[PDB]
Ligand binder design. Structure first.
Ligand SMILES: [K+]
Ligand SMILES: [K+]
Ligand SMILES: [K+]
Ligand SMILES: [K+]
Ligand SMILES: [K+]
Ligand SMILES: [K+]
Ligand SMILES: [K+]
Ligand SMILES: [K+]
Ligand SMILES: [K+]
Ligand SMILES: [K+]
Ligand SMILES: [K+]
Ligand SMILES: [K+]
Ligand SMILES: [Mg+2]
Ligand SMILES: [Mg+2]
Ligand SMILES: [Mg+2]
Ligand SMILES: [Mg+2]
Ligand SMILES: [Mg+2]
Ligand SMILES: [Mg+2]
Ligand SMILES: [Mg+2]
Ligand SMILES: [Mg+2]
Ligand SMILES: [Mg+2]
Ligand SMILES: [Mg+2]
Ligand SMILES: [Mg+2]
Ligand SMILES: [Mg+2]
Ligand SMILES: [Mg+2]
Ligand SMILES: [Mg+2]
Ligand SMILES: [Mg+2]
Ligand SMILES: [Mg+2]
Ligand SMILES: [Mg+2]
Ligand SMILES: [Mg+2]
Ligand SMILES: [Mg+2]
Ligand SMILES: [Mg+2]
Ligand SMILES: [Mg+2]
Ligand SMILES: [Mg+2]
Ligand SMILES: [Mg+2]
Ligand SMILES: [Mg+2]
Ligand SMILES: [Mg+2]
Ligand SMILES: [Mg+2]
Ligand SMILES: [Mg+2]
Ligand SMILES: [Mg+2]
Ligand SMILES: [Mg+2]
Ligand SMILES: [Mg+2]
Ligand SMILES: [Mg+2]
Ligand SMILES: [Mg+2]
Ligand SMILES: [Mg+2]
Ligand SMILES: [Mg+2]
Ligand SMILES: [Mg+2]
Ligand SMILES: [Mg+2]
Ligand SMILES: [Mg+2]
Ligand SMILES: [Mg+2]
Ligand SMILES: [Mg+2]
Ligand SMILES: [Mg+2]
Ligand SMILES: [Mg+2]
Ligand SMILES: [Mg+2]
Ligand SMILES: [Mg+2]
Ligand SMILES: [Mg+2]
Ligand SMILES: [Mg+2]
Ligand SMILES: [Mg+2]
Ligand SMILES: [Mg+2]
Ligand SMILES: [Mg+2]
Ligand SMILES: [Mg+2]
Ligand SMILES: [Mg+2]
Ligand SMILES: [Mg+2]
Ligand SMILES: [Mg+2]
Ligand SMILES: [Mg+2]
Ligand SMILES: [Mg+2]
Ligand SMILES: [Mg+2]
Ligand SMILES: [Mg+2]
Ligand SMILES: [Mg+2]
Ligand SMILES: [Mg+2]
Ligand SMILES: [Mg+2]
Ligand SMILES: [Mg+2]
Ligand SMILES: [Mg+2]
Ligand SMILES: [Mg+2]
Ligand SMILES: [Mg+2]
Ligand SMILES: [Mg+2]
Ligand SMILES: [Mg+2]
Ligand SMILES: [Mg+2]
Ligand SMILES: [Mg+2]
Ligand SMILES: [Mg+2]
Ligand SMILES: [Mg+2]
Ligand code: NA
Ligand code: NA
Ligand code: NA
Ligand code: NA
Ligand code: NA
Ligand code: NA
Ligand code: NA
Ligand code: NA
Ligand code: NA
Ligand code: NA
Ligand code: NA
Ligand code: NA
Ligand code: NA
Ligand code: NA
Ligand code: NA
Ligand code: NA
Ligand code: NA
Length: 254
RNA sequence: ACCGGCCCUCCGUGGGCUGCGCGCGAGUGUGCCUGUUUGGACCCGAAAGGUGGUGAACUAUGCCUGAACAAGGUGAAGCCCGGGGAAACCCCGGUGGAGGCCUGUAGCGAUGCUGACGUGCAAAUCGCUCGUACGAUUUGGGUAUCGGAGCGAAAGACUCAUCGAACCACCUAGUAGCUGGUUCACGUCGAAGUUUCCCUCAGGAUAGCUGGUGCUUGUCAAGAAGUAUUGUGCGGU
RNA sequence: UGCAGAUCUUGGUUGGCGUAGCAAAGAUCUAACGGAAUAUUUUUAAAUGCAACGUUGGAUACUGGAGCGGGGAAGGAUUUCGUGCCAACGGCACUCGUACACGAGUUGUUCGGUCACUGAGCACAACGUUACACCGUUUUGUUAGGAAAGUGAAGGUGCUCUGAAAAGGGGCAACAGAGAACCUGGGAU
RNA sequence: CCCAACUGCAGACCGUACUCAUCACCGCAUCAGGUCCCCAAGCAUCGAAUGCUCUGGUACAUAGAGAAAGGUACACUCAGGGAAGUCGGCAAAAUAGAUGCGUAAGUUCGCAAGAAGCAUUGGCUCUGAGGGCAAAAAUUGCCAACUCAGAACUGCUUACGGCGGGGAAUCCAACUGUAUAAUUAAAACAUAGGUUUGUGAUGCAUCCAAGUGGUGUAUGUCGCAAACUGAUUUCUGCCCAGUGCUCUGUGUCAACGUGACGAGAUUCACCGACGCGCGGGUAAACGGCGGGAGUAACUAUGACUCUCUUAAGGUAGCCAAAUGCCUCGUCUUCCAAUUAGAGACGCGCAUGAAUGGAUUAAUGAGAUUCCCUCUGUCCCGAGUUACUAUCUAGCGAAACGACAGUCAAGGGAACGGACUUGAAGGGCUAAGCGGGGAAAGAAGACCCUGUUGAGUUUGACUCCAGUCUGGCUCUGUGCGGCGACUUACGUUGCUUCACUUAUCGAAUGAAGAGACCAAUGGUUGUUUUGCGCAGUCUUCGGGCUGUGCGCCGUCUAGGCUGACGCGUGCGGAACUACUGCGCCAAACGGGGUGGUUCUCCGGAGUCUUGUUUCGAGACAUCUGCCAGAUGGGGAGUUUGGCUGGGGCGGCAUAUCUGUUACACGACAACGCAGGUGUCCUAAGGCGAGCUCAGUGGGAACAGAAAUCUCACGUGGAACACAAGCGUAAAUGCUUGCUUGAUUAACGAUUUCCAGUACGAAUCGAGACUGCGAAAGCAAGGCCAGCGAUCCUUUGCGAAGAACAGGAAAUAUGAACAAAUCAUACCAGAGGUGUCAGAAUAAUUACCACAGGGAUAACUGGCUUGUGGCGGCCAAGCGUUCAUAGCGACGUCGCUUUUUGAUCCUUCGAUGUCGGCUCUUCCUAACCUAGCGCCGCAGAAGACGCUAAGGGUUGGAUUGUUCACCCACUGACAGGGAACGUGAGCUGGGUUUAGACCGUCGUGAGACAGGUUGGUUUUACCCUACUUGGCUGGAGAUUG
RNA sequence: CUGUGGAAAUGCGAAACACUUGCCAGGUGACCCAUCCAUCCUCCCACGGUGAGCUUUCUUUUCACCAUAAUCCACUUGGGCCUCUCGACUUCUCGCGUUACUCGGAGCGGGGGCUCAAGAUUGAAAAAUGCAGCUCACCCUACGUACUGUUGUGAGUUCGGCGCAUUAAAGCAAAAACCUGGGGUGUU
RNA sequence: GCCCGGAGUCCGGGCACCA
């Protein structure tokens, strides 16, 4: 046979991200001495749109801690951010929408976004259009905090990780029907080469495990093992169950 | 009878087997022809397999930076002015110019005549007719992804007239129980398509039929005869 | 070391045969001149030198500005110009020619490129891997466990010492992007 | 030294001609193909449509003459009828601009829509409406542009170009789009909408020979990766038994470990993970979703009942549907007539629910039926034009070419140009034509064979990457817990917890770590910080253990309490406010030392048993090496034979009996009738006694059949089994005793046969025996019942005796000895049934090669069962009467228009159904001519004779031949000619590649099932035929 | 005096309104459709002067031409802003404006000003050029010399108005080079 | 063939195959 399309994407030749018009990575500011002992004040200068992303971004301007110069950062904007607003980051920052605080300084039951999973990672959780986390409890003996992720899972992180108060802007994006193949064409223009999609049963036996036959059909169960080699692992991978879901859903993941 | 080897018995000047043994040597070197075997192997011929390199100017898809798209039809939202009504709200006339909207040039395609040509203008072209024509649109240059690999709105399509595995050189004069060929004269002889075994049934080995070289002899006849006679046996058509 | 055949190899010759044809894009006519291509006869004029070629004037007609108009890129590289010339070539013809021969022609402070920008991208150095570099990384601000700055602010001396500040090696990739100081007339071919 | 206005001098390098295309580029070429950019006039007109023209550019494409046939056309017209043509309205005709009026069902309310349909349109002369700019303003004056609406008069030959035909229905796909360059544009793909799965980064998917390597990821669940269905509306039923996927506590599974016997190799015991088994879940995972009886007041049907059975027994819906074999189903409608269309019905070979069911407005170069208009598609053809062909001037090929070119019959390799017999035939030739040359092209692609392949699949055989799992190593420090070992003290195997230096993850331009707040810290230190107590050692110098006291060692914003003590705190000087945009750098000062110059110290806290900082941490998410499972993701190879083709079937593949078999022996077929892969310690061996099957006469229950008795009884019984042969004081039956079913020095021979092996059998010699009084019989059950090389495995070569290897002691392990281990020689056993003995699953319609007429699918040839057409005899039918007309039970033929049987010709090719067109032949006579006969009154008919000269139709449905209806007629006969006729046509069907459905298969795929779409090439040669001309010749050229 | 004028929008240029690659911050480069108005230019008309065409009859007629490069100097239309009006919708429903989807106490409109963009006019260049006519005029062989002439309210047309500027789950590259300012140096 | 388990021993499992 020939190589399956799932394996060909791993080479990454014509299937890499389109990033010519992107503005760069969106991160919180570097954790330094000032943020660990006091607070730094910044000003929101502009709200900008980046192709391939749903949530808007904010340009915040700070003063350099040690030099006579200005530092410009690029972050994911929470809902309610406006131009001219003052942003405070540090252990002594107050509790308000748009501030960045250590997780141990936020009262249980608050809504946060842009949460670090490692101290100094500069934000890796709850970054999509309308997502947020919820603080559940603090453990002062071990200095750890418990969070509820947008997927419904619970995670424990060190209390020195930072987070932003509020929810990400741009929510409710997936509620509008697309109605046209042309609209999907423009949506994927800024992400990567992955659309349109051809079904496996419509291909030939040389290309896909589902191809071939005088009728269009899979001839074997479509649930495939976790240990299957690449080129054989297509269909529903290591599925614990199949079919229409009746009742309360279970929590996805491991 | 003797030499070597394996044995049996009543244990003898018994017995019975076995050797590519002995039994007054015949070998060895060289020339030449014929036969068997390996090699390119009497001459020409596959579909395949492997090692290393060259191609995205045809064509497939992504990216960067440029260019292009007559003339009409229909008439969405928003806005204006009038009426009706207790209200809620409803109605007419304008304006405006939306749409993977319609007719239709250029452009991009290729439905029918199963038209023309069919040793052509052409190793796919020509004529009418036909699809679409502000969009998932057409197009220049640059750049990125390939050979058990690349790319594909998927037809096993396309990757320089080559693709159900490209091209170039080499291993390679690849192997072929199968098809084709195989160059002077006269003379003496002259067949078989049957038996047994073989993954054997388009092929071999084996016996038979044939040729050559003879050996030992005889000469009217040995171990002669596809025939009779006499005698003596066999038989169930 | 002897050939009649292997859809055998390489040359030459051959009937078919002066045959099949040389039928898309409408079309030419006339006088004069040129040319060896005539108005060519011994044995009145027609019935015995046909047919065809270039230039100029006139006539007729086509292309019909999405042109058999005027300029460029890719590609080609003397096909450009003058004079001469008709053996072979332009599947008919040639006195014509993008044919053949002999000589000529391309001029920039300002036009295009470059000096001198970045893009999709490439891959020297450094490091790592490989039996073997002919392998990998090398723009998400950016090489390398990584000492890659050779520049020089204020100040002193005299008419040339001491040192503040600057993180992230060296290149290439656009003749349609960025950039770029000149216009008309000519009797000047 | 800086500058303004001038001025003086100098301004480097490469490109520059021409072209950019119906002749300069790529297509072998000056090729009707292809190739990016800029400039773009006048009139008609909505106009870059189309037609004509000024500027600029061309007259370059081989020409002249000129009404043959047949052709091509970006050329036309036809009376009357109007699809009767055809598979099919293919092709052509036809509608058409603008303005006014008007417009159906259905519908997602947007559309459908230009729905459908009616009317007007020329020319000329007039009239009205629609505006700007000025002024001392419902006024006056001046002036531009081309639309719209009317009136009178007058005319038509309906008159350029350009420009939708329309309607009623069924099937499929929602729509725009894509897509097999060069035979398929579609119902296929995509799409929006819907559902499911994995996954919180040390992740999921995944590239890669390898590394601190790479992609989705410049990302973070409203995300990324992997599948299925295919808009909206209304819905999506039951099954977890099978296969798969997935989640939890003890049988089995490997290395590594831990112990034993032994001198050691060897061997044994215990321990030992994932996985597989057990136990759950899961169908919008692959898939699946029944039989048989009876039963209601006429019959029918069966609401009802019973029965067998499943994991569940097809629910809502829909149907002779692109799915129904029978089948042209049955009823209605459409027509004069319908294998067609529509609407109904449903025990549906084999419909059915995201392998999606049902329905749908709009859309479609998609499939099908009907209607209006229109027509040369047809009845049935005719006339005209331009370019060819035709003749001439110039120029000038190819294909093909054994040799050649008149027929009839015959035989022949079964369809001759050549051969046999007959019949024609003077020579040369121009234009046509498609009967023959089984004409040309291409070593048949269909079918079969080869110990040839390739693409694809999986439950084939043998393996490899990837994933998971165990062991060791990487690997360090303490305090404990639970066991083990050996005579409570020492090691060790697992572990709880606390550490940090190995290692791992992340961030940062390695940008402020920890302490100073003080110990179950260290105190051998940069330039001289140690001092005691107790115990115990000593090289007599001083150590070690445990303890104390000094030293290392130290500052600070704020806030409480009594400058200065104590506690707290832990490195701190921040506009408010409810939410909204200001500037900050290259040091001021102050001390010490130098002469208000130059330097040090603060401003700006000190220190470092040292790690850049966080997180984890001796684990794995790390490195390497062994071990196990999984693993069509990938590699390699295989997938019997015979055969009235091959396949399915069968075994004629190794073997036994009777017959074919022709009176020695031998003899074929997928010939006939039957057997074999076993069974028996007795069913083997011997001695003795006896006589079987059956029949007849007799005896309580007792009978046709129980047991007893007498007689006859040539085997009619028995002998394991198939059959044949054989046997009577026995080869049979009963009984007694036994192990000849052992060993048997390589003795010889028969059968098959090569005079090989294997199996079976025959005649002997030697040992020890059995039964017999003995002679004698017996080393299986008479003849069928079985197996090479290599490899594995068992038995025999006991103990002693021999001054030496001998008649009589098995041999070797090569320098030699002791004990193990291994090997050799002889006789058996574990098996090859394809049986003289390879280790082996499918598919190809995407297909390939070498060959085969040794072999199938057409024609032809032999045959004629079957099909068709006839005779002879005469039981009966015919009011009686065998024979007007028929004729059973039987029997004799003919034909090659059916289909079978065979395999002779053709596989380096003879174009494979039907229709259209055209000619000819046959007679078994439908009509037409003339007759005989009747159950012939007339009329209409039945049967038969001579006779093939003439004739033999128009339509609906279907690809059809065939079939069946409507209508006309004198009649609507049957057949042949390579199942006449494709270089004559057509291409509907059949039979490639695309795609859908049903059934089958795990799958790739299959179906003589249904459906839609799918290049038809060449004549100029010879002959034949049709016309057209030139010209010799009687010794048919001469005598 | 130590740049300077104006209450303000912001103006003033012979050389001190000098320097600023120590440093920092902005901007230009730099990107967006369609409608409407519309540049350079083209085509039509009107006005008429040079030469040709036709003229049996008509035609104050038909045709050709009628031009101004770069560079430099000195009233309109549109946008933004300042000032005054002791500042408008006080009051049953205010006002300005576009073909068009709207704007105003966070300051409409009106008078007067400042500034930007696109044009108009005037002049230097520039008539000395170019194009036609005459060329039996005045010459002779010279490319020879004199001389004459030199309106649009139309219809098209992307330069510009024009962007924080299009459908948008689509939101329209970057850098060199250059410009200005904040601080600082400098003149008295 | 090995390990088992359940009945001198027949079945059910998990493994292993040079005549
Ligand atoms: K040889
Ligand atoms: K190539
Ligand atoms: K429109
Ligand atoms: K309709
Ligand atoms: K369209
Ligand atoms: K299509
Ligand atoms: K199509
Ligand atoms: K289509
Ligand atoms: K001629
Ligand atoms: K000629
Ligand atoms: K000629
Ligand atoms: K012929
Ligand atoms: Mg990238
Ligand atoms: Mg900062
Ligand atoms: Mg397909
Ligand atoms: Mg596969
Ligand atoms: Mg298929
Ligand atoms: Mg070869
Ligand atoms: Mg091979
Ligand atoms: Mg290309
Ligand atoms: Mg259209
Ligand atoms: Mg054709
Ligand atoms: Mg296919
Ligand atoms: Mg050879
Ligand atoms: Mg031969
Ligand atoms: Mg002879
Ligand atoms: Mg064999
Ligand atoms: Mg020769
Ligand atoms: Mg000719
Ligand atoms: Mg021709
Ligand atoms: Mg013309
Ligand atoms: Mg020529
Ligand atoms: Mg030349
Ligand atoms: Mg780059
Ligand atoms: Mg440029
Ligand atoms: Mg330049
Ligand atoms: Mg051409
Ligand atoms: Mg007009
Ligand atoms: Mg045109
Ligand atoms: Mg036009
Ligand atoms: Mg020509
Ligand atoms: Mg007619
Ligand atoms: Mg008529
Ligand atoms: Mg018909
Ligand atoms: Mg048609
Ligand atoms: Mg209606
Ligand atoms: Mg109409
Ligand atoms: Mg469609
Ligand atoms: Mg379409
Ligand atoms: Mg095609
Ligand atoms: Mg749906
Ligand atoms: Mg649907
Ligand atoms: Mg199940
Ligand atoms: Mg049905
Ligand atoms: Mg049907
Ligand atoms: Mg019909
Ligand atoms: Mg079914
Ligand atoms: Mg279901
Ligand atoms: Mg189905
Ligand atoms: Mg459409
Ligand atoms: Mg279509
Ligand atoms: Mg004949
Ligand atoms: Mg012949
Ligand atoms: Mg062949
Ligand atoms: Mg064979
Ligand atoms: Mg395989
Ligand atoms: Mg005999
Ligand atoms: Mg015999
Ligand atoms: Mg006896
Ligand atoms: Mg015997
Ligand atoms: Mg197919
Ligand atoms: Mg044959
Ligand atoms: Mg042949
Ligand atoms: Mg042929
Ligand atoms: Mg033929
Ligand atoms: Mg026949
Ligand atoms: Mg035929
Ligand atoms: Mg044909
Ligand atoms: Mg035919
Ligand atoms: Mg024919
Ligand atoms: Mg078909
Ligand atoms: Na799809
Ligand atoms: Na399907
Ligand atoms: Na399916
Ligand atoms: Na459209
Ligand atoms: Na042969
Ligand atoms: Na042109
Ligand atoms: Na460059
Ligand atoms: Na050109
Ligand atoms: Na030409
Ligand atoms: Na589809
Ligand atoms: Na299951
Ligand atoms: Na049903
Ligand atoms: Na029907
Ligand atoms: Na750091
Ligand atoms: Na066979
Ligand atoms: Na017969
Ligand atoms: Na007759």
């Amino acid at each position: 046979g020939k190589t399956v399309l799932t394996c060909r994407k791993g080479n990454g030749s014509v299937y890499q991200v389109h990033g010519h018009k992107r503005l760069g990575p969106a991160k919180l500011r570097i954790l330094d001495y000032a943020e660990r002992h006091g607070f730094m004040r910044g000003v929101v200068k502009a709200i900008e749109h980046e192709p391939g992303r749903g949530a808007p971004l904010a340009r915040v301007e700070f003063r350099h801690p040690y030099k006579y110069r200005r530092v410009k950062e690029l972050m994911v904007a929470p809902e309610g951010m406006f131009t001219g607003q003052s942003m405070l980051c540090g252990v002594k920052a107050p509790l308000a929408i748009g501030n960045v605080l250590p997780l141990g300084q936020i009262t249980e039951g608050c809504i946060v976004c842009n949460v670090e999973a490692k101290v100094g990672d500069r934000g890796t959780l709850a970054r999509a259009s309308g997502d947020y986390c919820i603080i559940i409890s603090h453990n002062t003996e071990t200095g750890r905090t418990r969070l509820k992720l947008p997927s419904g899972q619970k995670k424990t992180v060190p209390s020195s990780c930072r987070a932003m108060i509020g929810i990400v802007a741009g929510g409710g994006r997936i509620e509008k029907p697309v109605l046209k193949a042309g609209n999907s064409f423009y949506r994927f223009r800024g992400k990567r080469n992955c659309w349109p999609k051809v079904r496996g049963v419509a291909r030939n036996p040389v290309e896909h495990p589902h191809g071939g036959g005088n009728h269009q059909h899979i001839g074997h169960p479509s649930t495939v093992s976790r240990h299957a080699p690449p080129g054989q692992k297509v269909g529903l991978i290591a599925a614990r169950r199949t079919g229409r879901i009746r009742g309360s859903r279970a929590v996805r993941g491991a």
